[PDB]
Design a protein around this ligand. Structure first.
Ligand SMILES: Nc1ncnc2c1ncn2[C@@H]1O[C@H](COP(=O)(O)OP(=O)(O)O)[C@@H](O)[C@H]1O
Ligand SMILES: Nc1ncnc2c1ncn2[C@@H]1O[C@H](COP(=O)(O)OP(=O)(O)O)[C@@H](O)[C@H]1O
Ligand SMILES: Nc1ncnc2c1ncn2[C@@H]1O[C@H](COP(=O)(O)OP(=O)(O)O)[C@@H](O)[C@H]1O
Ligand SMILES: Nc1ncnc2c1ncn2[C@@H]1O[C@H](COP(=O)(O)OP(=O)(O)O)[C@@H](O)[C@H]1O
Ligand SMILES: [Ca+2]
Ligand SMILES: [Ca+2]
Ligand SMILES: [Ca+2]
Ligand SMILES: [Ca+2]
Ligand SMILES: [Ca+2]
Ligand SMILES: [Ca+2]
Ligand SMILES: [Ca+2]
Ligand SMILES: [Ca+2]
Ligand SMILES: [Ca+2]
Ligand SMILES: [Ca+2]
Ligand SMILES: [Mg+2]
Ligand SMILES: [Mg+2]
Ligand SMILES: [Mg+2]
Ligand SMILES: [Mg+2]
Lengths: 380, 380, 380, 380
């Protein structure tokens, strides 16, 4: 049975066409998403959550957001390499390599580790071996990036059936290929990137009409906003700068994202990090305990919300379209669950956005739809 | 652009996937159906209505219902040949041949004439040349009959894409491939044949579960019922037996079917055949003028309506199904328009039958759907 | 406990339908017809086909096209009163009355009579008395005219569940509500009116962008074009002016419409009116018998076709839309069956019209769907 | 002029939703939550989360699960009255009252209070006061219980447009009404009840073939299984019986539910209750801190899973159906999010459940659709 795979910059999702319906599969960690993170520690290499859970402690051996480099040449990525803590070096071909303890990997090899783990754990969950997949890529990827992604799947031991666009995969998952003439604005906000795509769906041609976005705007920026708030409140209370202790900083990142997620369903939550630091005078343990209201959370992220408007406006103008001429706005990415993002979408386009399908599963589901179709299997 | 073609035993229909929607095309005679009739007269051969309009006058050179012979061996068809007025002879292979004035044609060659005329007139209507088609056949046809039909299309100059089942084509045209799990009873009543098919639509497999029918039950039997009524009423009034004059009989067949069709939309109609015969005593012209009520029409056809039940009951039993277990009954064939047939269907299965699509166009539309799909074109 | 129905109260014909087994079914009347002429005649009182069959004979006791005056004040339909053979006088209020032999009636009372026959005859097909209905009205009707139509239903003995637009009930029958956002041009040509409606179906609503049309362009005008031709050709061949005889004119009108309906599906038909007039010199009977081809029919109705351009170009201009910006064109009204009309749409809009559903039943079918859904029924 | 809403009045939680832009939107309450606990507490009067957060502290002024008594007579719920901490006395009629500090209330009045908060808080998201609603009830409710639920809405100040079955509103949200005939098993597991419903959606109706379930099997029982484990482990490690302290028991209940929700998407979570009790010898504080794995969670809740077999096998037997004869199994209720539950369905029915829509919002979403359609709105 063929599967769909969302090779995302932050998380990856696998799904399979089961009985005409896409089903997302759990990983070994019991989670429907696998972080796109590989950790090279002194021992067995870590891939997934266990890698992301130690990324602050192991900056030299943890490779994250490798998707920003896959398929590009170094002269084009010099700046983004200055923004990463791991070593990014050019290859014999002008390519990109990651150097850990002197060893050298390609972004296709790093990506292939994430893909292999997804297929391994999914094959266990399904009780059959998975060898054929459809992998998705951002609409703005070129042939080099599409082939490099296809290579990453082959290296992981997969027969790659097709490399399709993420926004198309989303439209497939929402079934907008079955509603005649649709003009779809895909509003993709994920871990680190923001992506606006305008699709002219009609007579079966998914014609991309405009792209825009923000390559450094995502849910992790909301996370850091909480982190800086929590550390400032702790320096003021105890004179301890938790951002200087990699162990305390790693728990702040972990606790911040958890509180943000809880605040997508409720008005107030409490961050509690016991034994976070030692009191400088008495050397006794210190426990962080703060309550974050959604109201404060939204004040902290407002500059991120205000930057959503630009890409949306530019994509409309680049396509010659009015908010009124958009026939459907679909929400993609785990970060569109923030109620404030949803309101921002309403205010930007004057329409109620489709939120039927899980936003962090919609790509993987559409990709699995494509897969089953290429293999004869149908939909409902 | 690929087309669908219903090579029917009485009429043939052509249709094309236009803008995601099947459109049936008119022939040279401005009619959405072309009779499956070829006439070999002393001159240019007649194919279509002009052939059917002279079939009583030219019994030796008019070939009708050739579909009953296509792809079968003579030893299997000896009896049906005794039922036709034209010569049916075996070939060097045990096949079937039609002999007109000593010349010899195959049912594939006769059929190819009907198909060629359909493509010729349709190519004029569309302004582009038509070379690729999907042709349909009864579900009970074997490989010999499917290949012979495919041959008839190739002989007509067509690239045959696929030979699919008529009931599947109907289900396609009704869109029942887009309603998950459907158990469909196809109720096909056409010119001369009655066909009941049970389709297990589910997960994309159109599994035929049962077939039954009546190879000599159709709309022409209703026509003859009117004819015998009109001739008896005319013998009683004038001592003239209009069935003995091929010219008067040809007008009775033509006028009978027209009155039947009018009585599908209204309660009463008038058959008026002026100058039909000469008065035996005075040699002056005689004019037939009778009014047929739908009530009388239904009395005349009741034995045809009562024979509908058998095949339906046998197909349910052959499939192990109850009327309640049928998920949908679709009406196929120009003859299911008779309000009495529709009531008979309600009473047989206890369900309201789907009559959305034109019953004499539903096959050709589904076939054109199949065609466009094999060629990438989509639906709405 | 009873089944609610939908009713198209049209200017020329009225149609009733119900939703049986999730299926929209148009019901026949006592005369076995799926359309009931919107005509009332006082001779006994006549309502429907019988009233239409003697409309030329009884020019002042026959009320027809009452929909032009319903809900309107006399001071605004004064010029339309001068165009009808029956008496139209203002009431004590600014309203509109029709005077027949001193007896006064209102547009509501006249309409209510058409409705009562529909419910009475339909109640006998279903086996139970219909009490609730959904009645349709032109999109351009005001609240006064919508109030009046609902009143005519209450007089008839109906509970009016809702008064919805005819262009909306058409899109319902065609399922456009299940295709996200669709821009739809509704091409409505009936017995005597031409109506163009542009809809944007989406965001929960049927947004009317533009309305256009011709109040005196319809299928009846094509009828008169055939009548005038037959009358002149008989003038030319026998020196008798049939249009001066109410008995012959009545037969011509009846026959012209039938020839038209036949020339929708065939290239040639024959009009036969035996004993239509007497020779002025010989006092001997004369029989009309003329064959009419579609080509002649289409040359007689050509001036009528030329008037279809204007309203379509005005609504597009009134909406800011291009024929390419129309997603779907649906065909409504008995006149849209004429092939020359469908061709005119093809040329004005560049796309093939939707004729999947009977143009004279599609509106009543939507209203049937709107009644079932308000009664907790759903479409199968 | 206003927007009508749909409301799930559930045994444990209540959900409100509306149909904005043809889209079903669940609305948050004043506490920013998409579910409002069906609890009322008199201390001031408390309704919702605040009433649930002090339910262990105020055992006799807190009314919960009032849906067990609504519409029912006292002589029939006598044994269910003995199972609750608050007073349940018979009224002057055979009805049911709850006595709190001498003050009497009815199930309708208690329910009406839950409803009033939903409409009040939702009216502030929409900007207009909601006056019309569609409220859902279990398929097994009688007219008395359906009457009572509508009365509770009228007390709340609502016009009850209709009282529809929860299993029908679920199929609406899942669009099963647009798939011809579907046999659907609705697996409903909520806070405290288990409900199995077999539907045959077709022929215009939602035919209930079988109803089954467990009145005391739900998500709350999984909560108590976690509470009892924490209480015994604390007994074992500190010799303090937290279940004897209403203040600690209240915190345990609150924390056990949160750990459960986290173990729906992860393999391991930690419960942390600082300052939960005092040492009996030292009078020094004690902090609970236990990590709970899904595997332990799934072993604690295993007896609850075993009880899911019975009702499913009884409804299949009560319908004459085979797991293979079920076309679709849809997942409803907050408890169906537990992975062990979805696995149990996979095994009992042999097919993957539909979890495309949030199991705790799907019913309110259908009711939202049923309100928009009765108000002339349609789904985008
Ligand atoms: N319920 C939620 N509420 C708010 N943010 C969420 C929620 N779930 C996930 N996110 C955030 O969304 C992001 C994950 O989105 P995803 O589509 O998986 O990323 P990517 O496409 O960048 O690989 C993370 O920043 C995560 O914190
Ligand atoms: N409106 C109608 N009412 C009744 N019978 C009709 C009507 N239209 C066509 N028929 C009859 O239906 C038959 C044509 O059906 P068709 O499906 O074209 O035939 P076949 O499948 O046998 O080639 C003829 O007997 C014709 O008289
Ligand atoms: N099959 C047909 N072919 C041609 N014209 C037709 C056909 N059926 C109906 N018409 C014409 O359409 C008109 C009736 O249209 P209809 O929708 O019933 O009217 P209205 O909506 O104006 O009340 C008549 O003039 C009739 O002659
Ligand atoms: N994500 C989740 N994971 C696990 N259990 C959950 C989740 N969400 C809700 N539940 C549980 O489901 C129950 C609520 O279900 P719900 O449908 O709201 O209740 P009801 O229909 O009985 O009023 C609670 O016991 C809650 O703990
Ligand atoms: Ca399925
Ligand atoms: Ca659309
Ligand atoms: Ca628009
Ligand atoms: Ca559009
Ligand atoms: Ca839309
Ligand atoms: Ca189209
Ligand atoms: Ca189905
Ligand atoms: Ca059934
Ligand atoms: Ca079934
Ligand atoms: Ca059905
Ligand atoms: Mg993503
Ligand atoms: Mg046929
Ligand atoms: Mg009309
Ligand atoms: Mg519930």
């Amino acid at each position: 049975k063929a599967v769909g795979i969302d090779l995302g910059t932050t998380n990856s999702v696998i799904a399979v066409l089961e009985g005409g319906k896409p089903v997302v599969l759990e990983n070994a960690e019991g989670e429907r998403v696998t972080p796109s993170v590989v950790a090279f520690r002194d021992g067995e290499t870590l891939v997934g959550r266990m890698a992301k859970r130690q990324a602050v402690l192991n900056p030299e051996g943890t490779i994250f957001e490798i998707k920003r480099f896959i398929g590009r040449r170094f002269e084009e990525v010099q700046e983004e390499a200055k923004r990463v803590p791991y070593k990014v070096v050019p290859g014999p071909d002008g390519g990109v390599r990651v150097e850990v303890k002197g060893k050298l990997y390609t972004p296709e090899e790093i990506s292939a580790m994430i893909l292999r783990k997804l297929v391994e754990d999914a094959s266990k969950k399904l009780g059959e071996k998975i060898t054929k997949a459809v992998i998705t890529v951002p609409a703005y990827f070129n042939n080099a990036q599409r082939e490099a992604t296809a290579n990453a799947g082959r290296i992981a031991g997969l027969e790659v059936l097709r490399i399709i666009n993420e926004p198309t995969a989303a439209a497939l998952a929402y079934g907008l290929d079955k509603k005649g003439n649709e003009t779809v604005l895909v509003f993709d906000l994920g871990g680190g990137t923001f992506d606006v795509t305008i699709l002219e769906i009609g007579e079966g041609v998914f014609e991309v009409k405009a792209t825009s976005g923000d390559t450094h705007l995502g849910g992790s920026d909301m996370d850091h906003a909480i982190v800086n708030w929590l550390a400032e409140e702790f320096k003021k209370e105890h004179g301890v700068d938790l951002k200087a202790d990699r162990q305390a900083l790693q728990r702040l990142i972990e606790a911040a994202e958890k509180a943000k997620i809880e605040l997508s369903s409720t008005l107030e939550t409490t961050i509690s990090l016991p034994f976070i630091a030692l009191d400088p005078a008495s050397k006794t343990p210190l426990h962080l305990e703060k309550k974050l209201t959604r109201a404060k959370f939204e004040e902290l992220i407002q500059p991120l919300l205000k930057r959503l408007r630009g890409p949306v406006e530019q994509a409309l103008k680049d396509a010659g379209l009015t908010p009124a001429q958009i026939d459907e706005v679909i929400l993609v990415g785990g970060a569109t669950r923030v109620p404030a993002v949803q309101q921002v979408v309403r205010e930007l386009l004057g329409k109620e956005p489709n939120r039927s399908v899980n936003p962090d599963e919609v790509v993987a589901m559409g990709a699995a739809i494509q897969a089953g179709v290429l293999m004869g299997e149908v939909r409902d």
